[PDB]
Amino acid sequence: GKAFDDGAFTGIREINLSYNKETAIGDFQVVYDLNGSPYVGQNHVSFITGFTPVKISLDFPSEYIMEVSGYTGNVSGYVVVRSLTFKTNKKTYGPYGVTSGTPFNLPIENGLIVGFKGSIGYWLDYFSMYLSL
Amino acid sequence: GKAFDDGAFTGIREINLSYNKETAIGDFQVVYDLNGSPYVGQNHVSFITGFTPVKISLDFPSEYIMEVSGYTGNVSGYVVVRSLTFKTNKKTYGPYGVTSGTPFNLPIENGLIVGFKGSIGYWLDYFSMYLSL
Amino acid sequence: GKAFDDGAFTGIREINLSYNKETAIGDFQVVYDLNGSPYVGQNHVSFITGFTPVKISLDFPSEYIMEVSGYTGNVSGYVVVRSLTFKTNKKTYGPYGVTSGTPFNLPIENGLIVGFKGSIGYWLDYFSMYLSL
Amino acid sequence: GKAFDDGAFTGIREINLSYNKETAIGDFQVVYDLNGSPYVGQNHVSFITGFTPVKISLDFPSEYIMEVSGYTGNVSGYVVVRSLTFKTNKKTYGPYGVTSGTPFNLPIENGLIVGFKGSIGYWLDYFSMYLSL
Amino acid sequence: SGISQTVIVGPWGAK
Amino acid sequence: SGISQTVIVGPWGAK
Amino acid sequence: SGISQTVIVGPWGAK
Amino acid sequence: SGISQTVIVGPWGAK
Ligand SMILES: CO[C@H]1O[C@H](CO)[C@H](O)[C@H](O[C@@H]2O[C@H](CO)[C@H](O)[C@H](O)[C@H]2O)[C@H]1NC(C)=O
Ligand SMILES: CO[C@H]1O[C@H](CO)[C@H](O)[C@H](O[C@@H]2O[C@H](CO)[C@H](O)[C@H](O)[C@H]2O)[C@H]1NC(C)=O
Ligand SMILES: CO[C@H]1O[C@H](CO)[C@H](O)[C@H](O[C@@H]2O[C@H](CO)[C@H](O)[C@H](O)[C@H]2O)[C@H]1NC(C)=O
Ligand SMILES: CO[C@H]1O[C@H](CO)[C@H](O)[C@H](O[C@@H]2O[C@H](CO)[C@H](O)[C@H](O)[C@H]2O)[C@H]1NC(C)=O
16 A cells, blocks of 8 residues: 555544445544644545545544554455554543454553554555654 | 553563462562662462472673563452463463463563563453553 | 743754844744654744844754753843753764843753743843653 | 762752851751651762861751752862752741852742752852752 | 653553 | 743843 | 654554 | 653763
8 A cells, every 4th residue: 555654743632434334444634733823734546436425523632543443454455454443531432434353452541642643545545643741 | 360560661671470370470570680780570470289390591792582471360250361482583482371361572672671460369360561762 | 021931842842042242132932842853942032133143053952951041131221041052972063142231040950841831021031941750 | 070870859848958157068967858758868079178167957748948059169260069058848947158259049830950960179069959849 | 850761662462 | 731842941141 | 962852652454 | 663762951060
């Protein structure tokens, strides 16, 4: 897939992603906070279409992600991220996608997610997160 | 269980833990690096016995943990950490314990594990890790 | 004066400031690096005019500030920053302004300046710096 | 002089230094906090004697240093740290030594001093500070 | 406070 | 809060 | 270099 | 390396 790296910011305001309940996660885009102002990150799109979009608007700065979880598995011979769930101090968003395969979860006790990087081909191949105090 | 919190240090030199191939992880103790010198952390012991010990001596500072993985599951009605695996830039230590239940893994792209906290009763109930650059 | 706070970024690419050899520092503006791309910070201007501008273009990312020094003193009854000097790993820029009053200097052994905040009225009243690894 | 480097810790509990009102700062030793417990740092002593000691006991963790200032100057042909002043959120300790020469000051808006390094011969040649959130 | 902070991830296991 | 923190040194100048 | 660093955890998914 | 890093300001005094 095509690798992307948004880098690190001051916080997260909104997440826009798409999924297909039969395959995996597709598009991924984040609106970050940059020192008090919104900063629209680049839209990282799948090479294909047919995904269902969803918008996750956080009540920044009072609301923030405390845990990210999901599943990774094989789709058409490729290991990809099949589902994602975002748990904040207020609500739980998701799961989005297919909850099948190998689970993973990153609970944060102290700190914040301030950026994302990864790769998307037909689906989200992999992703990593920037953490800061 | 009895909660413990070693706090944060400069790095990790050695890990001493015990496990039982029929149940879960028991004792946990770490020898940290504290500004160039070894610092022996407190030994956090299980309320019971019958565990098999193992010593993980790292070639500090050239060798460091890049990924921690394991399994959590029910044992005698309690959710505990059943197995742990430590992957460094040189070897893979483990898995130690029972590889059954729900998997979890924390790969580190940039940064270091510099401390541990958690709780141990009959077995390791849960644990968290301090991360730093 | 009017307070300003640019916040924290990924690095510094260029600094644009103005000074008067009879008084103190006036305008202050910084072009930061934001995850590999230039980010033009807001221009913080003096309430008055008559200053001499100067542009400090750094060879980012190979060139970075290692020490900031200057002088603070009274001008028309106000304590302000009268001069600034920026020393990088390649050149020394300045001093700009009047080298009279009380000196100050911030040498950095490990880390980077990633942001500025302060206040400007007729002159630069005060300023602070964001530091990060 | 003989270089020293205590490294980084969790905070500062006490500072023990000595000075001579005719020359400069001599001995320097710090009792740090290491994850909730006191950690006695090595005593860094002058090659000579005749200094007046002083103990600065901070009300950790409610009391912490917010600004360090002092003077550097020539003594017997050597540039050394002639005086130091430690300002916390509760009191001001010092000045200790001779307030003559070139002043310097490090005010901290956000963050903490968590370690010291430097060099001492007959007097404190130079010193640096570790900062962390 | 006068106590240094560090990022902490977890916990994994019992909640 | 959900806002990242950074070490800040200063200010130098007027208090 | 003159580029700020941050802790990064991952990746999860394909290796 | 496997050694943690921290911001360090200074030195003040002799160079
Ligand atoms: C249908 O192929 C495209 O979409 C899949 C799933 O999203 C992959 O991104 C695939 O890329 C190939 O991915 C593997 C790992 O699973 C490895 O990174 C290969 O080098 C890479 O080509 C992608 N196709 C292309 C050519 O981008
Ligand atoms: C046999 O009971 C002891 O050992 C188990 C497994 O290691 C637990 O540590 C158990 O503690 C109880 O644990 C739950 C969660 O699984 C919750 O934290 C309870 O409040 C806690 O008592 C432990 N027993 C005791 C009393 O320490
Ligand atoms: C001529 O007055 C303006 O310019 C000076 C120097 O730049 C100051 O910024 C002054 O502001 C006043 O500054 C003091 C400290 O030196 C204190 O912060 C006062 O509250 C503030 O008004 C500025 N005038 C105004 C009204 O902005
Ligand atoms: C009387 O000489 C000793 O004490 C002075 C002041 O404390 C210096 O530490 C001096 O060391 C020499 O210092 C310079 C800088 O001012 C440079 O670092 C020289 O290489 C160093 O020898 C110290 N004498 C000795 C030999 O340690």
